[PDB]
């Protein structure tokens, strides 16, 4: 029993040696030649690594493209220019006439 299970482990790791040799050969032949450069890598980092870096941000399902639109709530005095105000005044209601036409 001891004999047999010991030799079993022996050729278990024999097969492991064979696997490792073919693994090395596969790698150094095929995969080191076919490896991508890294120019076209994935342009992002996983959320777990960001969370460990202290980098992750969760918010703002929406955005504000223009700085004029971003700084509206901070200006407090001209959220809209005068021209913009008069342009906005044209859309106080929806146009049922245009809807109908």
């Amino acid at each position: 029993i001891q004999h047999w299970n010991k030799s079993y482990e022996k050729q278990v790791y024999s097969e492991s040696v064979a696997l490792n040799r073919t693994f090395q050969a596969r790698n150094q032949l095929v995969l080191d030649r076919l490896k991508p450069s890294g120019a076209y890598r994935l342009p992002a980092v996983d959320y777990k690594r960001q969370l460990s870096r202290g980098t992750l941000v969760e918010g703002a399902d929406f955005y504000l493209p223009t700085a004029q639109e971003q700084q509206r709530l901070a200006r407090h005095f001209e959220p809209y220019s005068e021209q913009e105000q008069e342009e906005r005044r044209k859309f106080r209601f929806q146009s049922i006439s245009v809807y109908l036409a």
Binding site: K6, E9, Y13, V17, N20, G59, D61, F62, L64, R92
Partner: protein
């Protein structure tokens, strides 16, 4: 003013230009924001964050209700190391030794070269251990916990040794070499072939230091170091166990894998290398800085002492050093862990 509940809503919003921007921000630039008075408030923000985290966890995590965990045959780094804790340790010890580095730079996926070397070392160790077991364990008639205990005991042991040596300023002294006996004096003088100098500190330092010549102030390869240690141990008649000896040999091998500069830079000393590679988050950082400060300011003013002045001194140093080593066994019961205490008993 009129009563605001009497006032028309659209008239109020036409009058107000600020909350117009508040509505556009949440109801024109988005389509899914809740119809509450304050979508920017902390309750809403934190609710959004928690929903985000719960959604991503439910989607990505390995669970009993898996969405994305499916058709898994080749696992990624994180899941692989989360399922196989044995391999994270092996892959991590190899990284720190083959490349002197911090855990924060642990690579996502190791190289196949490293993996193959790991398998070869596994061959060596399993061969030796299996053949030892075959001989001795049969003529008689949870690995995680064991590894944790082994590593804890080992780091405790090395910490105790470092404290013992720092007690007499023998911990990391290079190019100096400490000596507590005339035998060791001769042994380390054979290095420089009698050249060099010898230095002393008075009766608080219980050892005497030796300076070789600048051409022979080099550090030795780790395989040579291990061979020297083991040869000395067998000459004294105290050989290590074969498993531990193989452990030392593999450690020396992976350190040799570093190459020419395996521990120190050209113009660097071993103390400077230790302080360089020392983790700054380590609790003992200030302790080591204290020790090295004291050691530097003492060795700056250490006095020179020629050869024969030391041997007569080295006799009494040997005496009080063996007395201190006898006291050490009781001193381990003072503050050492239960493992160290029971192994001393």
């Amino acid at each position: 003013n009129p009563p605001v509940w009497k006032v028309n809503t659209n008239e109020w919003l036409d009058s107000d230009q600020y909350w117009q921007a508040f509505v556009e921000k949440h109801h024109f630039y988005s389509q899914y924001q809740p119809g509450v008075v304050d979508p920017e408030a902390p309750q809403e923000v934190e609710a959004f964050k928690q929903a985000w985290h719960s959604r991503m966890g439910k989607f990505n995590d390995r669970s009993d209700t898996p969405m994305l965990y499916a058709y898994m045959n080749e696992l990624p780094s994180w899941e692989y190391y989360d399922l196989h804790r044995s391999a994270f340790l092996e892959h991590m010890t190899y990284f720190l030794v083959r490349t002197g580095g911090d855990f924060r730079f642990f690579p996502e996926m190791p190289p196949w070269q490293w993996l193959a070397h790991m398998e070869n070392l596994r061959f060596k160790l399993l061969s030796v251990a299996q053949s030892r077991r075959s001989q001795l364990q049969l003529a008689n008639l949870h690995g995680e916990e064991y590894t944790q205990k082994f590593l804890q005991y080992e780091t405790e042991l090395f910490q105790a040794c470092a404290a013992r040596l720092m007690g007499h300023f023998m911990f990391l002294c290079d190019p100096f070499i400490p000596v507590q006996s005339a035998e060791a004096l001769s042994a380390v003088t054979r290095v420089d072939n009698g050249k060099g100098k010898l230095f002393s500190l008075g009766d608080d330092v219980n050892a005497l230091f030796y300076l070789p010549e600048q051409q022979r102030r080099d550090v030795e390869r780790p395989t040579q170091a291990v061979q020297t240690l083991l040869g000395h141990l067998e000459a004294t008649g105290r050989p290590f166990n074969p498993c531990y000896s193989e452990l030392l040999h593999v450690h020396a091998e992976v350190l040799e894998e570093r190459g020419e500069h395996w521990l120190t830079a050209p113009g660097e000393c071993v103390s400077q290398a230790f302080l360089r590679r020392l983790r700054t988050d380590d609790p003992a950082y200030e302790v080591y800085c204290s020790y090295f400060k004291e050691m530097y300011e003492r060795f700056a003013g250490a006095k020179e002492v020629s050869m024969e002045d030391g041997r007569k001194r080295l006799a009494t140093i040997e005496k009080n050093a063996q007395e201190e080593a006898a006291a050490y066994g009781l001193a381990l019961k003072t503050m050492g862990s239960a493992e160290l205490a029971h192994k001393a008993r």
